[model samples]
Target: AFRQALQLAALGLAGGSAAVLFSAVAVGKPRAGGD
Candidate 1:
């Protein structure tokens, strides 16, 4: 059970980092909208 939980946590971390990386690559403009 402990090993399974550890694996799950690792997967979560990897996925979170991947999401952050994808967002960083996908965005190229400042976030604020009003001019």
Candidate 2:
């Protein structure tokens, strides 16, 4: 039972230094339909 709590606590530290994944949003390809 103690192990359960310990594992969860350790996971918190790992997530603290999260790495950003590649991601991109639409570059005004639409919206208003005219630039």
Candidate 3:
């Protein structure tokens, strides 16, 4: 049971990490070249 719970936690962490990574990449993108 503990192992199953751990696996679930890891899955959640992976998803959260992906979201943060994507947000970082989005912010790093160049804007429309205007102010």
Candidate 4:
């Protein structure tokens, strides 16, 4: 049970990180494919 709980927490952290990255992209970012 303890190990299962840790797994769930790790998944949640990963999801939160993804959300942060997505929001950062959604807000504003310098052009990458420009010359």
Task: Please provide, for model 1 over 1-35, each residue's C-alpha lDDT reduced to its tens digit, 9 standing for 90 to 100.
Answer: 99999989988878886878868865874566643
Tell me the tens digit of each residue's lDDT in model 2 across 1-35: 79998888887866453423211224333456533
lDDT of 4 by residue, 1-35 (tens): 99999989988878786878967896787767854
The clash count of every prediction, one per candidate, is: 0, 0, 0, 0
Ranked by lDDT, the better of candidates 2 and 4 is: 4
Q: For model 2, give the RMSD to the true fold.
A: 12.0
Task: Report the CA-based lDDT of candidate 3 relative to the real structure.
Answer: 0.80
> What are the clashing pairs of model 1?
none
Cα deviation of 19 in candidate 2 (Å)? 7.0
Error of 4 at 13 (Å): 0.5
lDDT of each: 0.78, 0.53, 0.80, 0.81
Give candidate 1's error at residue 11 in angstroms.
0.3
> What does candidate 3's lDDT look like per residue over 1-35, in tens digits?
99999999988878786878867977877766644
lDDT of 1 at 4: 100
Better of 1 and 4 by TM-score: 1
- Using lDDT as the measure, what is the rank order of every candidate, best first? 4, 3, 1, 2
Off by over 4 Å in 3: 16-35
